[PDB]
Enzyme design. Structure first.
Site, mmCIF file in Angstrom:
data_model
loop_
_atom_site.group_PDB
_atom_site.id
_atom_site.type_symbol
_atom_site.label_atom_id
_atom_site.label_comp_id
_atom_site.label_asym_id
_atom_site.label_seq_id
_atom_site.Cartn_x
_atom_site.Cartn_y
_atom_site.Cartn_z
ATOM 1 N N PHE A 1 3.669 -10.193 12.466
ATOM 2 C CA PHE A 1 2.811 -9.632 13.498
ATOM 3 C C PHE A 1 2.799 -10.469 14.779
ATOM 4 O O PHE A 1 2.504 -11.662 14.754
ATOM 5 C CB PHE A 1 1.369 -9.537 13.000
ATOM 6 C CG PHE A 1 0.372 -9.053 14.026
ATOM 7 C CD1 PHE A 1 0.318 -7.715 14.388
ATOM 8 C CD2 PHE A 1 -0.535 -9.930 14.606
ATOM 9 C CE1 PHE A 1 -0.615 -7.271 15.311
ATOM 10 C CE2 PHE A 1 -1.455 -9.483 15.539
ATOM 11 C CZ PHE A 1 -1.494 -8.155 15.898
ATOM 12 N N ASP B 1 6.827 17.333 -9.618
ATOM 13 C CA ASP B 1 7.082 15.972 -9.181
ATOM 14 C C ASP B 1 8.460 15.912 -8.523
ATOM 15 O O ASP B 1 8.952 16.935 -8.046
ATOM 16 C CB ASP B 1 6.887 14.966 -10.320
ATOM 17 C CG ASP B 1 6.403 13.613 -9.819
ATOM 18 O OD1 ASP B 1 5.176 13.451 -9.594
ATOM 19 O OD2 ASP B 1 7.265 12.735 -9.622
ATOM 20 N N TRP C 1 1.557 12.024 -2.609
ATOM 21 C CA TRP C 1 2.268 11.377 -1.516
ATOM 22 C C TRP C 1 2.756 10.004 -1.972
ATOM 23 O O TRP C 1 1.977 9.049 -1.984
ATOM 24 C CB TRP C 1 1.361 11.272 -0.285
ATOM 25 C CG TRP C 1 1.971 10.670 0.951
ATOM 26 C CD1 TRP C 1 2.405 9.385 1.139
ATOM 27 C CD2 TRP C 1 2.116 11.328 2.227
ATOM 28 N NE1 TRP C 1 2.831 9.204 2.429
ATOM 29 C CE2 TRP C 1 2.676 10.387 3.116
ATOM 30 C CE3 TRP C 1 1.859 12.629 2.687
ATOM 31 C CZ2 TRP C 1 2.964 10.708 4.442
ATOM 32 C CZ3 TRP C 1 2.142 12.950 4.000
ATOM 33 C CH2 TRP C 1 2.681 11.990 4.867
ATOM 34 N N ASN D 1 7.987 4.394 -2.221
ATOM 35 C CA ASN D 1 8.566 3.714 -3.375
ATOM 36 C C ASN D 1 9.338 2.419 -3.113
ATOM 37 O O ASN D 1 10.055 1.972 -4.003
ATOM 38 C CB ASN D 1 9.461 4.624 -4.216
ATOM 39 C CG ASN D 1 9.016 4.503 -5.651
ATOM 40 O OD1 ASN D 1 8.246 5.338 -6.111
ATOM 41 N ND2 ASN D 1 9.377 3.394 -6.297
ATOM 42 N N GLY E 1 4.753 3.903 -6.192
ATOM 43 C CA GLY E 1 5.131 3.461 -7.531
ATOM 44 C C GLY E 1 3.876 3.105 -8.327
ATOM 45 O O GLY E 1 3.739 1.980 -8.823
ATOM 46 N N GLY E 2 2.962 4.085 -8.407
ATOM 47 C CA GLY E 2 1.606 3.860 -8.873
ATOM 48 C C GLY E 2 0.759 3.210 -7.781
ATOM 49 O O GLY E 2 0.605 3.771 -6.693
ATOM 50 N N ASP F 1 -5.599 1.028 -1.379
ATOM 51 C CA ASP F 1 -6.534 0.297 -0.548
ATOM 52 C C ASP F 1 -7.430 1.291 0.190
ATOM 53 O O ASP F 1 -7.270 2.508 0.049
ATOM 54 C CB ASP F 1 -5.767 -0.656 0.370
ATOM 55 C CG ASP F 1 -4.787 0.102 1.246
ATOM 56 O OD1 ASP F 1 -5.244 0.982 2.014
ATOM 57 O OD2 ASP F 1 -3.571 -0.159 1.124
ATOM 58 N N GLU G 1 -0.856 18.764 -32.035
ATOM 59 C CA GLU G 1 -0.958 17.908 -30.871
ATOM 60 C C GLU G 1 -1.454 18.737 -29.687
ATOM 61 O O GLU G 1 -2.279 18.256 -28.911
ATOM 62 C CB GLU G 1 0.401 17.245 -30.630
ATOM 63 C CG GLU G 1 0.682 16.099 -31.588
ATOM 64 C CD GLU G 1 2.152 15.734 -31.756
ATOM 65 O OE1 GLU G 1 3.005 16.401 -31.140
ATOM 66 O OE2 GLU G 1 2.439 14.799 -32.535
HETATM 67 O O1 LIG Z 1 10.401 9.361 -8.467
HETATM 68 C C1 LIG Z 1 9.200 9.971 -8.972
HETATM 69 C C2 LIG Z 1 8.197 8.866 -9.352
HETATM 70 O O2 LIG Z 1 7.867 8.118 -8.183
HETATM 71 C C3 LIG Z 1 7.043 6.949 -8.418
HETATM 72 O O3 LIG Z 1 7.364 5.942 -9.435
HETATM 73 C C4 LIG Z 1 8.709 5.444 -9.779
HETATM 74 C C5 LIG Z 1 8.879 5.196 -11.296
HETATM 75 O O4 LIG Z 1 8.465 6.267 -12.167
HETATM 76 C C6 LIG Z 1 10.339 4.779 -11.600
HETATM 77 O O5 LIG Z 1 10.601 4.739 -13.022
HETATM 78 O O6 LIG Z 1 10.623 3.495 -10.992
HETATM 79 C C7 LIG Z 1 10.428 3.418 -9.567
HETATM 80 C C8 LIG Z 1 10.520 1.931 -9.172
HETATM 81 O O7 LIG Z 1 11.855 1.426 -9.371
HETATM 82 C C9 LIG Z 1 9.118 4.117 -9.066
HETATM 83 O O8 LIG Z 1 8.046 3.160 -9.065
HETATM 84 C C10 LIG Z 1 5.684 7.539 -8.800
HETATM 85 O O9 LIG Z 1 4.672 6.522 -8.872
HETATM 86 C C11 LIG Z 1 5.857 8.249 -10.134
HETATM 87 O O10 LIG Z 1 4.582 8.711 -10.592
HETATM 88 C C12 LIG Z 1 6.886 9.375 -9.974
HETATM 89 O O11 LIG Z 1 6.300 10.352 -9.132
#
Ligand SMILES: OC[C@H]1O[C@H](O[C@@H]2[C@@H](O)[C@H](O)O[C@H](CO)[C@@H]2O)[C@H](O)[C@@H](O)[C@H]1O
Ligand SMILES: OC[C@H]1O[C@H](O[C@@H]2[C@@H](O)[C@H](O)O[C@H](CO)[C@@H]2O)[C@H](O)[C@@H](O)[C@H]1O
Ligand SMILES: OC[C@H]1O[C@H](O[C@@H]2[C@@H](O)[C@H](O)O[C@H](CO)[C@@H]2O)[C@H](O)[C@@H](O)[C@H]1O
Lengths: 721, 721, 246, 228
Positions: free
Chosen positions: A275, A361, A472, A475, A522-523, A528, A608
């Site tokens: 920054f 997805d 949204w 990654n 990626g989760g 935040d 199940e």
């Molecule tokens: O691509 C779809 C995917 O996106 C994000 O996570 C991925 C993960 O599942 C994959 O196995 O690895 C990469 C890192 O190398 C990403 O973190 C989303 O969070 C996931 O929910 C899915 O939508």
């Protein structure tokens, strides 16, 4: 009485149960008190002014006044204060400024920095405006502190104006700082990692500097923009906590510095790393909004304060008290390998078990058959979807399900028509090869052409299709900064990226405000309060393991409301952990969050399927308690605990979930006491029909019984009569 | 609603905010709940009955019921429970009993064991009487639990009846036991040493057995009959504490046992060591009274509960709310080297500085010119006192001072007319030389001739002389037990000594109830609730060093009210520590207790005399606040702290004393926050006339300023307007 | 079971003596039989480890350490059972899954490696095993015939302790030119750097050949740098490193 | 060099790398050193004898010698030592004894209590025999400490003889005791439970008494006869 008051040389910033009291001393601003409400403040806790060795002075003859030893609300370097500075501006041959207080104003109602996420529902607020000037540099710095009548939080930010005839450069500009008196303190932060987000860390404050920060261009999996400065020995139920948080999703830093005198400085803001900010004559810069929150009711107290503030003043009103749809997401279920028939079959099975929303997805766009191409190409793959997205959506709607869609707008693949048309749109340095991450690149959202393109493409997608929900994603983190025409423009591009992002998402979320937007990186890579201003839920973690989820949910809901916290029942063995867990436990853990499902329902047994249908019926009932109720942590899943337990109260409803990680033998049963009940209330436990007084449940507690085995769980459900 | 209730198979013992709930299960008594009030108890926290390996059973076919795994209120050995037993009686060829509950009664009002110190002011109490029998042994054990309507305390004791045709022998008989559920606990005890009494110890409960005990025949300097079982992480302000205490001044034991299942047993009573009790047919034995006290307001909470209970139900009513005289004691002032002229000169100087009571210490009797002779010979040394004790007393009275006198009735010197007349009155073993301690022996107060002699001599002394105050010393521990006609009578003699002591002191204190009796045992060698039943103050420690007194007063007032706690301004360098301390600090430390003076006032400068006169005037004012007010610990003098601070509130008066042990440099001033004020109250600080809200004093606090130097102190005095 | 209801004396004092006299009777009994039949291997037991002390170990050179035959629950048990007592004493059996005490599935490989840190035996119905499970056991038996001297006669070094908070256990044995190391991880982890496991009490200049990869490491490397421990995803996984000094 | 040595009023019990050095002081036995081998021991770590309040004395006139403050190898109750006793014998109207050292012998080779498990392979051992007597009670207590040439261990046990004309009753008779100097210490024990045997416990030594015990007639699942 609450709001802002100016009384002689004191300024009172008065939220509910929280005051900041500042004194103007000959142009210097001193922090007199931050904490519980004090009226008619006299100065019992004033700094004793004495000669401290090597702590220098603004005048020759007064050795006892020193900015090295005064408690302050912003920090400068070069005037005698050697603690870490929070404002530092280059001008001419120096980065010494000397901002002096000149004038105070009070605002009422809506107020905040332009282009950055800031509180809403501000009718009952007042803002103190402290105008400072450096006459030599011809710079203005204006500090804003805002009160809230219904929460123990104060919000802050600053504006720097260049009133000189020359370009100046901001090097440091944090959003909040406080000098706290020497005492023993602990700090709590949320750190962790990918697949281990928001790990709760607690430690003693020690001489020197402790900090968490992101230089990744996103706040990141491994640190959250939060820092809790706690009274020694704080517990869940008792002791003082001050939480400082940042409404920002880019590079940040939070630090605690314990200096030579045992004094303690805390600050949060944009990270100095990556920054710099050029200001031409008459330009200004405003920092993101910081929050300071207080409780004297321990860590549960601060959780409640922070959650409440978020629900009422950050999360969108359209969603903050709205029950969220139980979804199916096909990602873990199929990855990239799906087509129309598979989707509608999954949709059929989701409908039978009473799922409400169907999320398509990654892999529906361009030639996205794997994760090595196509990002940037937001064109529907009609071959794969077996027709238009319109026809797919109608099919889903006709099966009685809402429809959701995954996007990843901030990213571009080398192998994409977007990259072939515009290779310069990627963040990159001239003459350096790309650095890759998940074999993709990051779009330069500091480029206004990039922002315009994404507005256009996404507006088209959302206006032409009946989409109920957006996931949204984002990654990878940012490498190879070098898109500026000058070094300084590059130093600006990480923040400008954020401004571009916020312009993009505020636009789309506002123009399409019926759509539920769930954020993802990626989760929990960007979970935040900057993002939660526009996205009322977040994919908390790619780790969908019931057991690994326990510490994750602990952290993810620590300062943020449960309603935000996406959690899905997934397949076994779990894809991240390689673990078998009971379906019952997967259900109960996910029902401590915002419930959805992510596995191939078409390959489940009849049993199940039935179990899932029962879980869905259960949660339809628990959903208001979980999403709208009050959360109480009863046993924390930390690094050493073998257990987790979390309670929710909502009107006449009280539920308690209990999980045990490892099987035990010849060990007396845990006694689990509930919290925050009516002592005289009568509470009827659903499973045995027994009626217990609140006193019994709180002061005697439940003997928790389990069979032999790992990862077992149970739920207690009470109705108050 | 409070008192005792019997409802189906539950017994409710209900004090203010404290309940003990016991279940009769086929003759076995189970502890269901000890803690905060629960009505209509259902059993949420019942023990889950299962087969635990090697935990055996009363019947062949039910493997899940075991006294090894049930929570109980008394403990036996030999029926399957392997935890430490609290009742164990030899009869015929065994010490296995099996007492089974037969019948319950409820008493109202005054109740307690005969010949042992027990609560008073019992009009608003009820007692649960649980009658148990062992039909084979033909023994009765009766348990008593008493409620108090105005304190969170329950009192307990037991009576064992021999209804058989044969002699039986009690080997163990504790006064209270509770099985608490497996959980994390800490324990707090008061230990220490001579000249370091009542050192506050805190530690984690661990698997195995922890105990404190005395086998000295007196409770002792190094352990107090108290044990606090605390919720993990208890603080001064928060968390649950259970204090178990014994009203007994002889050999005791308190233990905490954590067993194989993580369960926790606590008990307090007469020490099994040095104890056996023969019961002939139809004889019975009653144990001393134990107390269990509860707070959910941390360690300050338990202090207040315990202090309150002591003030209202143990300490004599004649004195418990009566301001105590500021005294002069000549011991450190002259030791044995004094005569009439010296005494009256000291008396003159004491009167000038406004001292109220004059105490003549050791050396006035027999030929007690040193500490090697004369104990036992309570004859006035008229040569040394320059006439009769009557004439000395008149001289003191005429100077306007009350008169006090040192005794040590329980002791005998080899070199004394008493020993020459009755060598067999000493505790001794036939054919063994004496063991000596301070070159004296202990009288056998188990000998009724010894008790009769002491009643007679002391009744004579007190009826023939106008004595206002008695200091009752006891200066060694008991060795060489062998005065019985049989082994069993010797095993009984340590307890019988106590019964003899209590018969002696209850008689004298009752027959002479205008006299203020202060207990002593080389300072705090016997500072327990058995003694405090008859002696409303205690010489807390021979250590009169202002600084060494800090941890001593911390412990000595932890469970016992400040009014009990004798504290004297003494000479420098201090006689125990070899230390110079400021006279100001000696004054302030002693004024956190029951103030007196112990130095040669005749050898002071004019200035030092004036200082003392000012200290006396100050304390005449502070005395009600200190002695009658509410004590709040603000900074604790523990093993690592460099500071002590203690606050007292009393109506519109609040005082705070602050002491720093070692001088510091380049260290920010401490911030000291007051407790338990009215947030909106206005508090005027005497020294600067400034008026502070209670909120300011509690939430901002005082910046504590000191000059450079060791052992400095200061006092803050506030009046609420 | 343990002793209750003491009252067999003709007097109180004889009863007070009877618990010690019981022991004197026991020791007279077992010293007699173990001496008169000294070719027989006597293993002591008391619902597993209810009487595993040095009084019993005077006559019984091994002991059933615990009725808990769970591979994972056995880790703290073996830690304690071999703390003061030699490994050769410490009976340990590969048992069936789900485990009868813990209700737990553990890999057969891990059941084998944990039991091979003790005095190995088997306690499950071999007649109901698959052909594969039989073969695995035959391989475990062949392995231990080789490791037995190292384990039973060698020097034991604890490398990572299975205590109340640890997620890991590791134990090394040295015997002449043979060094073995067993590693167990209780819970699966993710995004966590691999453990570095250093061996003890080797010759710095010695050359140590690791069986699985044929690589030769100096003792200094193994002691001062150590092994990066690699595992797949999953609970209760284990591995063994076997070295020969050249 | 290993084995047992008697040199003036010192007794040296010397195993490999482990010595117990005991001093006979007018019939009382003082623990001078337990630890690593010291030859020609002078007493650098001797107890400083001073008047300790309420710590009493065998004679009227010497207030500085007290069994409450001396480091010992066995403990009695009733002579001024208030620490937990390890020998306590009822005789006539008392359970006060006062055993005083009378004579020392040294054995070589096989030695141990009859009817109780005891070490074997003892060819290279020596045993110190400390004969104590209580002349009034007419009781003998004999302490045995055995060296091993190939291990840092010392073995111990005791024999009590009734030489009186009356029945006596032993109430306490431990097998080993040591008074260690004030310092910070931790203790390690093996506890646990059935199906959780020999759980390793470590904790700080604190003022007061910590103990593990069995009253089950067997040493038990939940405690091992060991303390580190
Ligand atoms: O691509 C779809 C995917 O996106 C994000 O996570 C991925 C993960 O599942 C994959 O196995 O690895 C990469 C890192 O190398 C990403 O973190 C989303 O969070 C996931 O929910 C899915 O939508
Ligand atoms: O003898 C008078 C004296 O008795 C008690 O204390 C003494 C102490 O002063 C002396 O120096 O040592 C012995 C121990 O060896 C005693 O503890 C009283 O406590 C004291 O106040 C005084 O009254
Ligand atoms: O009875 C044979 C059996 O004896 C001991 O253990 C048993 C245990 O298996 C059983 O399930 O429970 C009881 C306790 O109630 C015993 O502890 C041996 O240890 C075991 O190996 C087996 O030989």
């Amino acid at each position: 009485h609450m709001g802002v008051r100016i009384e002689n040389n004191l300024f009172y910033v008065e939220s509910k149960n929280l005051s900041l009291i500042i004194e103007n001393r000959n142009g210097y601003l001193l922090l007199k008190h931050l904490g519980k409400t004090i009226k008619n403040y006299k100065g019992s806790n004033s700094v004793y002014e004495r000669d401290h060795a090597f702590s220098g002075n603004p005048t020759a003859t007064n050795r006892t006044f020193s900015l090295d030893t005064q408690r302050q609300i912003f920090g400068q370097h070069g005037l005698g204060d050697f603690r870490k500075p929070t404002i530092q501006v280059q001008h001419s041959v120096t980065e010494v400024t000397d901002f002096r207080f000149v004038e105070a104003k009070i605002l009422k109602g809506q107020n905040g920095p332009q282009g950055l996420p800031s509180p809403h529902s501000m009718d009952d607020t007042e803002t103190l405006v402290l105008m400072l000037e450096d006459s030599k540099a011809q710079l203005s710095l204006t500090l804003y502190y805002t009160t809230f009548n219904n929460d123990a939080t104060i919000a802050s930010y600053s504006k720097l104006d260049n009133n000189s005839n020359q370009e100046v450069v901001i090097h440091k500009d944090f959003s909040f700082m406080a000098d706290f008196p020497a005492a023993d303190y602990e700090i709590v932060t949320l750190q962790g990692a990918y697949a281990r987000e928001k790990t709760v860390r607690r430690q003693q404050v020690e001489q020197g500097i402790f900090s968490i920060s992101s230089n990744r261009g996103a706040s990141g999996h491994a640190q959250t923009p939060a820092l809790l400065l706690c009274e020694q020995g704080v517990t869940e139920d008792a002791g003082n906590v001050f939480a400082i948080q940042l409404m920002y999703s880019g590079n940040f830093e939070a630090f605690v510095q314990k200096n030579q005198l045992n004094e303690v400085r805390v600050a949060i803001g944009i990270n100095p790393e990556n920054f710099s900010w050029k200001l031409a004559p008459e330009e200004y810069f405003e920092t993101p909004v910081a929050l300071v929150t207080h409780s004297d009711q321990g860590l549960t107290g601060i959780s409640h304060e922070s959650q409440n503030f978020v629900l009422k003043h950050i999360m969108l009103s359209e969603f903050s008290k709205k029950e969220r749809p139980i979804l199916i997401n096909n990602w873990e279920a199929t990855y990239f390998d799906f087509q129309r028939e598979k989707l509608l079959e999954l949709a059929d099975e989701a409908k039978k078990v009473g799922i409400e929303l169907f999320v398509l997805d990654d892999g529906w766009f361009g030639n996205r058959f794997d994760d090595n191409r196509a990002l940037g190409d937001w064109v529907v793959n009609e071959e794969k979807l077996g027709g238009s997205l319109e026809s797919l959506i109608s099919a889903i709607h006709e099966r009685g399900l809402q429809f959701g869609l995954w996007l990843e707008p901030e990213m571009i693949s080398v192998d994409s028509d977007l990259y072939r048309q515009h290779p310069d749109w990627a963040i990159q340095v001239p003459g350096y090869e790309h650095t890759y991450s998940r074999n993709q690149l990051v779009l330069n959202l500091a480029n206004p052409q990039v922002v315009e393109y994404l507005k256009s493409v996404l507006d088209q997608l959302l206006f032409y299709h009946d989409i109920d929900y957006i996931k949204w994603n984002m990654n990878r983190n940012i490498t190879k900064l070098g898109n500026g025409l000058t070094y300084l423009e590059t130093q600006m591009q990480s923040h400008q990226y954020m401004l571009g992002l916020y312009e993009l998402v505020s636009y789309l979320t506002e123009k399409h405000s019926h759509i539920l937007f769930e954020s993802c990186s990626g989760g929990g890579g960007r979970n935040d309060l900057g993002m939660m201003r526009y996205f009322p839920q977040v994919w908390a973690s790619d780790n969908t393991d019931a057991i690994a989820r326990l510490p994750i949910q602990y952290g993810s809901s620590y300062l943020y409301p449960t309603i935000s916290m996406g959690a899905h029942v997934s397949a076994v063995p779990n894809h991240q952990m390689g673990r078998m867990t009971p379906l019952e436990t997967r259900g109960l853990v996910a029902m401590m969050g915002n419930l959805g499902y992510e596995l191939d329902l078409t390959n489940l047994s009849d049993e199940e399927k039935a179990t899932i249908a029962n879980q869905v019926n259960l949660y339809k009932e628990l959903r208001p308690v979980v999403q709208l109720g009050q959360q109480y942590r009863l046993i924390n899943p930390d690094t050493v605990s073998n257990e987790a337990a979390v309670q929710f109260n909502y009107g006449n409803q009280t539920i308690v979930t209990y999980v045990r990680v490892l099987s035990v033998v010849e060990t007396m049963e845990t006694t689990l006491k509930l919290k925050d009940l009516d002592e005289e209330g009568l509470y009827k436990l659903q499973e045995n029909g027994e009626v217990y007084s609140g006193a019994e449940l709180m002061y005697a507690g439940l003997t928790v019984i389990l069979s032999q085995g790992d990862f077992l769980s149970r739920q207690y459900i009470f109705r108050k009569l």
